[PDB]
Design an enzyme around this catalytic site. Structure first.
Site, short mmCIF file in Angstrom:
data_model
loop_
_atom_site.label_atom_id
_atom_site.label_comp_id
_atom_site.label_asym_id
_atom_site.label_seq_id
_atom_site.Cartn_x
_atom_site.Cartn_y
_atom_site.Cartn_z
N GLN A 35 6.25 7.51 -10.78
CA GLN A 35 5.64 8.67 -10.20
C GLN A 35 6.31 9.21 -8.91
OE1 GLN A 35 3.68 10.77 -12.00
NE2 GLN A 35 2.24 11.00 -10.15
N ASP A 41 0.97 -1.23 0.08
CA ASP A 41 0.10 0.13 0.07
C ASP A 41 0.95 1.13 0.00
OD1 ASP A 41 -2.22 -1.17 -0.09
OD2 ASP A 41 -3.35 -0.62 2.01
N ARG A 87 3.18 2.22 -10.96
CA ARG A 87 3.59 0.76 -11.17
C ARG A 87 3.56 0.35 -12.61
NH1 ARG A 87 -0.40 -1.06 -6.20
NH2 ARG A 87 -0.09 0.67 -4.96
N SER A 88 2.88 0.71 -13.35
CA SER A 88 2.54 0.31 -14.65
C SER A 88 3.86 0.79 -15.53
CB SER A 88 1.33 1.11 -15.19
OG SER A 88 0.33 0.91 -14.81
N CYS A 134 -2.57 -0.02 -13.48
CA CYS A 134 -2.67 0.20 -11.79
C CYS A 134 -3.86 0.85 -11.44
CB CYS A 134 -1.33 0.61 -11.37
SG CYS A 134 -0.49 2.01 -11.98
#
Ligand SMILES: [Mg+2]
EC number: 3.1.3.48
Length: 279
Positions: A260, A179, A219-220, A213
């Site tokens: 990011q 998370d 994460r992509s 994601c």
């Protein structure tokens, strides 16, 4: 790459390297994404597809979907990066998978994270309870599911209800990205990437893999960046010439925001380094 990683780590310059990439990243228009009629088709106001690389739905009234085609010329790999489907865009999502002839869907988030919904439950959870997307005339059935400790793989069957033609799709669901922050080790993420590769989902005999994601950038971006860097290290006469920063900036020409945080940038370097040692 490993010596560069150790130097950045010891100098504490991940934030500086990351900010330089953000500063130099491409800035292309997203006029179609910002049209008032498309407000309900976007999940985050700050994450939009560029007009030049957006995927168009083969729809006469509204061709818009928040998705981008990332075409890596030298690596000969393409990916579609998209947001996590919204309650009203699941039919559009599966229409894109159908029209683009994709074999795989890569999902890098859980439906609920941090106690909040990150995407619609866009695939069926039981074989006998199929989903029908009336707006795009598609039926989606769960064929099988293999739940592993770090990821789950599902076989789904997509049916065009107009013609009754069917297509088999593999759903690769990485279920263990924390998370907060990034995984401590890239081992499970790399095993996941290798399982996606082994399935044929990233191969040129199929349409581009669809990756998401929540926003389809963090994460992509790490998934595609790691895959492309590893492919280039295998293809080039000099694998040490592969510059992950340059590959990332190339990918950023096709969709904004890939990677990011500085933590995701450090994690991407770690995954490429450990992946290269394995390969
Ligand atoms: Mg059952």
């Amino acid at each position: 790459m490993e010596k560069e990683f150790e130097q950045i780590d010891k100098s504490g310059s991940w934030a500086a390297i990351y900010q330089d990439i953000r500063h130099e990243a491409s800035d292309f228009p997203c006029r179609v994404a910002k049209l008032p009629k498309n407000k309900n088709r976007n999940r985050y106001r700050d994450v939009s597809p560029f007009d030049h690389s957006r995927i168009k739905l083969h729809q006469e009234d509204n061709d818009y979907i928040n998705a981008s085609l990332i075409k890596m010329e030298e690596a000969q790999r393409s990916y579609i990066l998209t947001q996590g489907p919204l309650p009203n865009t699941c039919g559009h999502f599966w229409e894109m998978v159908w029209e683009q002839k994709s074999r795989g869907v890569v999902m890098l988030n859980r439906v609920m994270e941090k106690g909040s919904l990150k995407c619609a439950q866009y695939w069926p959870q039981k074989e006998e309870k199929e989903m029908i997307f009336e707006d795009t005339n598609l039926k989606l059935t769960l064929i099988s599911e293999d739940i592993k400790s770090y990821y789950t793989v599902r076989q789904l069957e997509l049916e065009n209800l107009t013609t009754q033609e069917t297509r088999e799709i593999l759903h690769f669901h990485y279920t263990t990205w924390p998370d907060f922050g990034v995984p401590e080790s890239p081992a499970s993420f790399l095993n996941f990437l290798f399982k996606v590769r082994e399935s044929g989902s990233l191969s040129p005999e199929h349409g581009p893999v669809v990756v998401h994601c929540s926003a389809g950038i963090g994460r992509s971006g790490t998934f595609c960046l790691a895959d492309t860097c590893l492919l280039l290290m295998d293809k080039r006469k000099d694998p040490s010439s592969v510059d992950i920063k340059k590959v990332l900036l190339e990918m950023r020409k096709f969709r904004m925001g890939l990677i990011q945080t500085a933590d995701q940038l450090r994690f991407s370097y770690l995954a490429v380094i450990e992946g290269a040692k394995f390969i």
